[PDB]
Design an enzyme around this catalytic site. Structure first.
Site, PDB file in Angstrom:
ATOM      1  CG  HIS A   1       6.371  -1.059  11.539  1.00  0.00           C
ATOM      2  ND1 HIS A   1       6.693  -2.172  12.297  1.00  0.00           N
ATOM      3  CD2 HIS A   1       6.529   0.022  12.345  1.00  0.00           C
ATOM      4  CE1 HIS A   1       7.014  -1.775  13.541  1.00  0.00           C
ATOM      5  NE2 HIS A   1       6.911  -0.450  13.593  1.00  0.00           N
TER       6      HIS A   1
ATOM      7  CG  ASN B   1       7.524  -2.961  17.763  1.00  0.00           C
ATOM      8  OD1 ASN B   1       6.850  -3.062  16.763  1.00  0.00           O
ATOM      9  ND2 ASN B   1       8.158  -1.826  18.116  1.00  0.00           N
TER      10      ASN B   1
ATOM     11  CG  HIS C   1      -5.129   3.459  15.063  1.00  0.00           C
ATOM     12  ND1 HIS C   1      -4.106   4.363  14.841  1.00  0.00           N
ATOM     13  CD2 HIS C   1      -5.905   3.987  16.038  1.00  0.00           C
ATOM     14  CE1 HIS C   1      -4.263   5.388  15.673  1.00  0.00           C
ATOM     15  NE2 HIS C   1      -5.332   5.176  16.413  1.00  0.00           N
TER      16      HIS C   1
HETATM   17  C1  HEM Z   1       5.210   0.932  21.569  1.00  0.00           C
HETATM   18  C2  HEM Z   1       5.657   1.670  20.541  1.00  0.00           C
HETATM   19  C3  HEM Z   1       5.178   1.290  19.122  1.00  0.00           C
HETATM   20  C4  HEM Z   1       4.893   0.063  18.614  1.00  0.00           C
HETATM   21  C5  HEM Z   1       4.930  -1.321  19.309  1.00  0.00           C
HETATM   22  C6  HEM Z   1       4.496   0.231  17.222  1.00  0.00           C
HETATM   23  C7  HEM Z   1       4.168  -0.795  16.329  1.00  0.00           C
HETATM   24  C8  HEM Z   1       3.834  -0.562  14.992  1.00  0.00           C
HETATM   25  C9  HEM Z   1       3.637  -1.580  14.018  1.00  0.00           C
HETATM   26  C10 HEM Z   1       3.747  -3.088  14.352  1.00  0.00           C
HETATM   27  C11 HEM Z   1       3.302  -0.995  12.847  1.00  0.00           C
HETATM   28  C12 HEM Z   1       2.974  -1.685  11.528  1.00  0.00           C
HETATM   29  C13 HEM Z   1       1.446  -2.067  11.419  1.00  0.00           C
HETATM   30  C14 HEM Z   1       1.300  -2.739  10.068  1.00  0.00           C
HETATM   31  O1  HEM Z   1       1.815  -3.901   9.907  1.00  0.00           O
HETATM   32  O2  HEM Z   1       0.704  -2.121   9.182  1.00  0.00           O
HETATM   33  C15 HEM Z   1       3.321   0.439  13.008  1.00  0.00           C
HETATM   34  C16 HEM Z   1       2.945   1.408  12.076  1.00  0.00           C
HETATM   35  C17 HEM Z   1       2.878   2.764  12.325  1.00  0.00           C
HETATM   36  N1  HEM Z   1       3.174   3.431  13.514  1.00  0.00           N
HETATM   37 FE1  HEM Z   1       3.715   2.516  15.264  1.00  0.00          FE
HETATM   38  N2  HEM Z   1       4.515   1.584  16.929  1.00  0.00           N
HETATM   39  C18 HEM Z   1       4.997   2.253  18.068  1.00  0.00           C
HETATM   40  C19 HEM Z   1       5.130   3.623  18.220  1.00  0.00           C
HETATM   41  C20 HEM Z   1       4.611   4.593  17.347  1.00  0.00           C
HETATM   42  C21 HEM Z   1       4.539   6.018  17.587  1.00  0.00           C
HETATM   43  C22 HEM Z   1       4.948   6.790  18.874  1.00  0.00           C
HETATM   44  C23 HEM Z   1       3.964   6.612  16.503  1.00  0.00           C
HETATM   45  C24 HEM Z   1       3.657   8.089  16.220  1.00  0.00           C
HETATM   46  C25 HEM Z   1       3.122   8.878  17.183  1.00  0.00           C
HETATM   47  C26 HEM Z   1       3.756   5.559  15.505  1.00  0.00           C
HETATM   48  C27 HEM Z   1       3.194   5.750  14.274  1.00  0.00           C
HETATM   49  C28 HEM Z   1       3.052   4.805  13.303  1.00  0.00           C
HETATM   50  C29 HEM Z   1       2.583   5.056  11.972  1.00  0.00           C
HETATM   51  C30 HEM Z   1       2.448   6.349  11.179  1.00  0.00           C
HETATM   52  C31 HEM Z   1       2.509   3.720  11.308  1.00  0.00           C
HETATM   53  C32 HEM Z   1       2.150   3.505   9.812  1.00  0.00           C
HETATM   54  C33 HEM Z   1       0.714   3.055  10.328  1.00  0.00           C
HETATM   55  C34 HEM Z   1       0.012   2.866   8.994  1.00  0.00           C
HETATM   56  O3  HEM Z   1       0.440   3.341   7.836  1.00  0.00           O
HETATM   57  O4  HEM Z   1      -0.972   2.155   8.922  1.00  0.00           O
HETATM   58  N3  HEM Z   1       4.094   4.346  16.100  1.00  0.00           N
HETATM   59  N4  HEM Z   1       3.643   0.638  14.311  1.00  0.00           N
END
Ligand code: HEM
Ligand code: HEM
Lengths: 726, 726
Positions: free
Chosen positions: A101, A174, A365
């Site tokens: 993202h 999402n 988060h």
């Molecule tokens: C239902 C499944 C998931 C959804 C809906 C989701 C949604 C999102 C969204 C919307 C963002 C961006 C937030 C922003 O705008 O800064 C993001 C970032 C992130 N997600 Fe997820 N995600 C999913 C699954 C996962 C999984 C399984 C992991 C790892 C175990 C993961 C790890 C990350 C990490 C590393 C970021 C970067 C967060 C950051 O730098 O602040 N995500 N996710």
């Protein structure tokens, strides 16, 4: 004094349509739009006008045009501390982008519930319709870097930071209601497979490559969200016109301790609308910032993005009542079975001041919950909880990221944590530990209770052995893909087949294409055959006989899964290109522009050059852009008023403008001699649905055009476009 | 979950044309291509076949599909160290991208000089025609992020790391022979102005926005490199078909101590070639990785990028003999005044293994010179010296970035520096200071001398007061823009006009456009009037009477500044689209392919679906891509063989393929009944120069087509394309 005498360098501090004025920092554009969070940011907002230029240490600079040298042609001297600070700060401007993202666009706004939800959750932000909660929302793509394009085919992120009186709650969702995988342990595998391939770092912003479809072919749990991404859901018209979902089942907990399962929805009040593939791809070229721009300009115009928060609620005793496991994130809960109950409204009404400071550094988060909410054992959610704090240590440089202004709670926060890089808060407590006597044990723990109480986890019973094992209830992969397919209109299904066909054509290894086609034949034979035909692949007799997966709890379709099966059209905030000529019929333009204005639809006046043209009656018309400069990709409809048409009839750009808008199914209206363009797009003399034509733009002409715009695109035109060379 | 039985998952480790096999890491594609640097990286190359999957601590993993949980539907447990390491590493994958030139593509290769240069330099890498120096080269854009598009309008970087026996020399240059600004102190101002604007972080990869043109209008020293950016130099066909330049005057120092001023040049042996704007912009959407891909595939095919290093040499006593200052990096040295002396040849012949490890982490810095080279007081180079080491401290995590494998010298390095984050080298020296007795003062200083000596600066005389002041000799801004303008062909001048017109039309504040047009009038009135006309601006009488700037040392033009005025075409490595039908005339295809093969031109076989078609003689033809999936943008010419033309004669995509290739000035060849497609591009039974036509595709047909391809584009067609709707 470098500003122009006439003050035209500076945009009006009032709502103005897209392209009317330069865009500006939100607090300059809309200084009177306030909320508690935006007001709490005042301590760090820095102005500029009338101030002297200084170093970061406050020393005024005399000559910001030159390094210090020995002689005006001599060597630069080490003692130039002003050059040294300025270049040092530039040298360290960048921070790591988000792992996923990384591309995203954000805005401030506010949320309010429609009624108190005290009977089902003690969450303070949902306790009182008069309680307003500031929000900051970032929308994003998934795969591409922060410098990638907006209108790629991809899932979109929809993340909301609610600054509540009892803590930050982040709903990190999402735009589809399921994810590709079941267990967080596979997230690095899945993401590696979709991201650019590691030898050469190609392709950006695309799942159309071998490793993605190799993984999908080997992990059928992905097929459900792959169906959504291959549909037009993967290419939204705007972040204002897509749905949002929390995907996981969470819990609401009320004051009496009762847990209710919940899935979170956002409904776009502007309706659901998507691009078509050719247009979206071409738009990544002509304007890779299209969604970012559209969001910022809607807000500057007052077309505030609004969303309704909704809950699907399932009693604890119904956990096992469906054919799919509620904790499996690759399964949706059909709204025919469990309706969405309307909960409240979110309005996004002010842009940031500085994109890096507020957007790039925002940290969301899904573990940030508040009393009244809780988790479940969804094994994808469970693993997310470890990722989002950890990643912020490198991305934002340490454990004090909550002190970066955009991330700060507006409510009190006090604890015994100390130090870390970039520590802003200066703690005066004599104690940094508890229990302590030297500060009478303050700050103190607080018991849970109905309001303002401490967080306690719901006491869910856990029973089993320590295992690395997928639940057998998760091992079904095709029924939800099939429900989604059957719920789409015929034109939506065509676009799905074309998405799969285009993507698999970019897969270099043909056996992978074949393997994907085999998975499709487990979902729906019609879909599989139509993709196979586009790939020059023949299904085997065994493939033709695979029995279809069962219905989902008796449903063979659910229209809420379609973008378009139930009209929800809203024209406000859309834009129309108006193709001018050097002697426009001023009466047409009066009728066109006022009808658009009355419905909040914007216009862009286009011509073969910039400057002005003069209408028949002497009215001076300013030109927004050239036909090449603002292509039909960037508008929702095209109007050609009457006038001296011979001016533009042989302009290839003008003719192509119409052919492109025609291919991409947009409404087109032609007044008077503008009907001479009919031959460019091959329209019959007697007309065709989706083309508005009359002797003038008067009478019912604009109403008919607006009716087409409400329906978004002219789907009946699909058979006629195959032939056109555009 | 394994490989296909047929071994088709794995590319052949032999040179193959683009599209023929999946691409692969360099060491697996071309295992027998070696050089001293490639071999030295063997200590850190890691394979994978036959090895067990482990944690980073070497523990074998049994189940890489599931988190550890209490029961198979229960919560994930904190003691899952295998999930934790895997997700931790993922969460920390990203490092900051480069502040500028973040988008770039790199390859390994080697350099050797044609003869010893010992009379003018003691640099070891130029001392012997048979001593080869490994290189690593990264080509880049400037403005956009690492996930931005390749074929934007921008300056390109061209950075070469030479791993010499006497140290690393980095030649960190661009693809135009000047820069936009004079003094490094303004670099953050200029970069901030061209980069996305700070409120909304738009636009990516484009100087087409208000802030950039604001700065330009207020800083006329930028105009020269702006002319270059707005010409087709701004949009190269390939990194193989652009020039390189070090921009600054440096010095060569020979064993006798004599200093000679030098400017560095790279000549591309594949010739100079650029896109046209509409094609470049659309290609950012259809394939934003076009140049990355093209470079990688050229190397896999054996079309290794080759460049001739060349020096402009000016004796010390001629420092002041021109009408511009040699130390001013906004001024070029015309090759009509000082010829480029050929010096040696660089060949890029292997792709990296891992893009992140080798490209993303490579660090180049123009301060990395070696004995026999030295600096000058150019005030832009002087301040660059402070930036490139400093920035690598946050980008690469600390001061040991030279231990990152790609950055390591292949010659010896030893000194008293210690520690720092991620210290790899374990020093055994009992001393960490000098002078020391305890290690007999080793490692020791080395006096300077003819070869293998220590570095000593040329003892330039410095006389002046400590001042922040621009040399008066730098205060001339118009004569080099004019020389460049006058040196371009009429079609190149048109493209310049169109580039300025397109860009300024996207500047929202009109007075900025006006001020830029006023600057153009100080350069050349025809240029100014042609841009003004496109903007609906009329020049004032004063503007019409501005005196043109003086010729540069009597030159009215210098054809070496044009891309096209002097033919230098080379078709080898170019690509033709062959549009197939379902009954191809095999005789045509045989003739086509044999002629293409003889000139090393590649073909891509396209059709309306994927899979195979069978020619008239039973030859099975696999299809590379569909007409939509690999547009004409991606090829240099188009050929349509005879066969069952009726199959594709009404296909909109096939017709549009030709209309786009026509508009973009590409050669088109039509055999037999394929000549029926002439109607789509409206063109004359007698034919037209640039469309090859014949009853069949023979030796004559192909010779004509290859002659057209050697001239790159059909510039005579320009007057005919304003009318084509494409
Ligand atoms: C239902 C499944 C998931 C959804 C809906 C989701 C949604 C999102 C969204 C919307 C963002 C961006 C937030 C922003 O705008 O800064 C993001 C970032 C992130 N997600 Fe997820 N995600 C999913 C699954 C996962 C999984 C399984 C992991 C790892 C175990 C993961 C790890 C990350 C990490 C590393 C970021 C970067 C967060 C950051 O730098 O602040 N995500 N996710
Ligand atoms: C003649 C003018 C200049 C040229 C030809 C030039 C060329 C380049 C090139 C080609 C790169 C990319 C190297 C790579 O591929 O990693 C680069 C990076 C960079 N340049 Fe320059 N540059 C110029 C002026 C400047 C100035 C005046 C400054 C600052 C004083 C500057 C600071 C930087 C920085 C911060 C990087 C990122 C370096 C890194 O992260 O490793 N450049 N430059």
């Amino acid at each position: 004094s470098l500003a122009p005498e006439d003050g035209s360098h500076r945009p009006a501090a009032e709502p103005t349509p897209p392209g009317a004025q330069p865009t500006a920092p939100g607090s300059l554009k809309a200084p009177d739009t306030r909320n508690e969070k935006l007001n709490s940011l005042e301590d760090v907002r820095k102005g500029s006008e009338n101030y002297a230029l200084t170093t970061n240490q406050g020393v005024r600079i005399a000559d910001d045009q030159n390094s210090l040298r020995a002689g005006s042609r001599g060597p630069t001297l080490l003692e130039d501390f002003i050059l040294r600070e300025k270049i040092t700060h530039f040298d360290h401007e960048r921070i790591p982008e988000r792992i996923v993202h990384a591309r995203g666009s954000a805005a401030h706004g506010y949320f309010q519930p429609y009624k108190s939800l005290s009977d089902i959750t003690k969450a303070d932000f949902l306790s009182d319709p008069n309680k307003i909660t500031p929000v900051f929302v970032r929308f994003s793509t998934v795969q591409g870097g922060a410098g990638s394009a907006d209108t790629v085919r991809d899932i979109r992120g929809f993340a909301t930071k609610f600054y509540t009186e009892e803590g930050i709650f982040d709903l990190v969702g999402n735009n589809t209601p399921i994810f590709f995988i079941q267990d967080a342990h596979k997230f690095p595998d899945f993401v590696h497979a979709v991201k650019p391939e590691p030898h050469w770092a190609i392709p950006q912003g695309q799942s159309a490559h071998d490793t993605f479809w190799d993984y999908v072919s080997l992990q059928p749990e992905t097929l459900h969200n792959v169906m959504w991404a291959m549909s037009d859901r993967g290419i939204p018209r705007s972040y204002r016109t897509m749905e949002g979902f929390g995907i996981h089942t969470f819990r609401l907990i009320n004051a009496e301790g009762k847990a209710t399962f919940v899935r979170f929805h956002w409904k776009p009040l502007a309706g659901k609308a998507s691009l078509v593939w050719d247009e979206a791809q071409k738009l990544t070229g002509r304007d890779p910032d299209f969604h970012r721009r559209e969001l910022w300009e809607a807000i500057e115009a007052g077309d505030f993005p609004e969303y309704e928060l909704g809950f699907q609620l399932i009693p604890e005793e119904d956990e096992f009542k469906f054919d799919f496991d509620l904790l499996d994130p690759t399964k949706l809960i059909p709204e025919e079975l469990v309706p969405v109950q309307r909960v409240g409204k979110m309005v996004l009404n002010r842009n940031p001041d500085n994109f890096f400071a507020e957007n790039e550094q925002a940290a969301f988060h899904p573990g940030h919950i508040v009393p009244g909410l809780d988790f479940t054992n969804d094994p994808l959610l469970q693993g997310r909880l470890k990722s989002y704090t950890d990643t912020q240590i490198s991305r934002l440089g340490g454990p004090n990221f909550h002190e970066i202004p955009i991330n700060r709670p507006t409510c009190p926060y006090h604890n015994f944590q100390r130090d870390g890089m970039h520590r802003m808060g200066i703690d005066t407590n004599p104690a940094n530990y508890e229990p302590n006597s030297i500060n009478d044990n303050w700050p103190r723990e607080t018991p849970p209770g109905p309001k303002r109480g401490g967080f306690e986890s719901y006491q869910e019973r856990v029973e089993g052995n320590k295992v690395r094992e997928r639940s057998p209830s998760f091992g079904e992969y095709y029924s939800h893909p099939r429900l989604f397919w059957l719920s789409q209109t015929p034109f939506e299904q065509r676009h799905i087949v074309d998405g799969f066909s285009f993507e698999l054509s970019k897969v270099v290894r043909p056996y992978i294409r074949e393997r994907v086609v085999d998975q499709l034949a487990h979902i729906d034979l019609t879909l599989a055959q139509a993709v196979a035909k586009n790939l020059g692949i023949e299904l085997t007799d065994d493939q033709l006989n695979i029995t279809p997966p069962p219905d989902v709890n008796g449903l063979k379709k659910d229209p809420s899964l379609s973008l378009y099966a139930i009209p929800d059209g809203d024209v406000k905030g859309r834009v129309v290109a108006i193709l001018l000529n050097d002697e426009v019929r001023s009466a047409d333009l009066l009728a066109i522009l006022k009808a658009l204005k009355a419905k909040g639809v914007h216009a862009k006046l286009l011509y073969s050059r910039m400057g002005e043209v003069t209408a028949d009656d002497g009215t001076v018309l300013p030109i927004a852009a050239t036909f090449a400069g603002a292509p039909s990709l960037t508008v929702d409809a095209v109007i050609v008023p009457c006038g001296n048409i011979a001016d533009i009839a042989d302009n290839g750009d003008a003719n192509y403008y119409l052919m492109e808008a025609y291919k991409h199914l947009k409404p087109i209206a032609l007044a008077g001699d503008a009907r001479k363009f009919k031959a460019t797009i091959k329209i019959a003399d007697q007309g065709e649905e989706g083309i508005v034509e009359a002797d003038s733009a008067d009478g019912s002409f604009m109403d008919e055009l607006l009716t087409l715009m409400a329906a978004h695109r002219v789907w009946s035109r699909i058979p006629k476009i195959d032939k056109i060379p555009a």
